[PDB]
Amino acid sequence: NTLISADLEIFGKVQGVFFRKHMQAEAKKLGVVGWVQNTDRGTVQAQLQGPISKVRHLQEWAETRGSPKSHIDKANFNNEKVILKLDYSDFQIVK
Predict the structure, then answer these.
(1) CA pair distance 34, 73, nearest whole angstrom
(2) In what order do the strands lie in the sheet with 3-13?
(3) Is 78 noted as a catalytic residue in this protein?
(4) Hey, is 46 helix, strand or coil?
């Protein structure tokens, strides 16, 4: 039904801990597409697209679960918009 696109950035101990791999794995199970990236500021950034329910599940994962060794201090969500079709075919880990 309703598709959304939404940005996020996660802060804390979030690099070097398989965060990108685990986020990608969860997104693929959920049917969420887009990308995730390590920033040069020690944070993780992503864009998520998909059915709102599935995006919400992945956003919850990013904010409260993460990978086993990650510690999440904060999660920022913004630029959410309703979209009519997906701009991505799957969820990529990007450099």
Answers:
(1) 23
(2) 71-83, 3-13, 44-51, 33-38, 91-94
(3) no
(4) strand
Q: What DSSP character marks residue 54?
A: H
Q: Is 79 a catalytic residue?
A: no
User: If residue 27 lies in a helix (H) or strand (E), which one and from where to where?
Assistant: helix 19-30
For this experimental structure, what is the resolution in angstroms? 2.0
Name the token pair of 82: 């309703």
Marked catalytic residue, from 1, 38, 76, 79: 38
Q: Any idea which fold 1-95 has?
A: Alpha-Beta Plaits (3.30.70)
Q: Amino acid identity, residue 81?
A: K
Domain ranges in the chain are: 1-95
Catalytic-role residue among 1, 20, 76, 79:
20
What are the E-state strand segments in the chain?
3-13, 33-38, 44-51, 71-83, 91-94
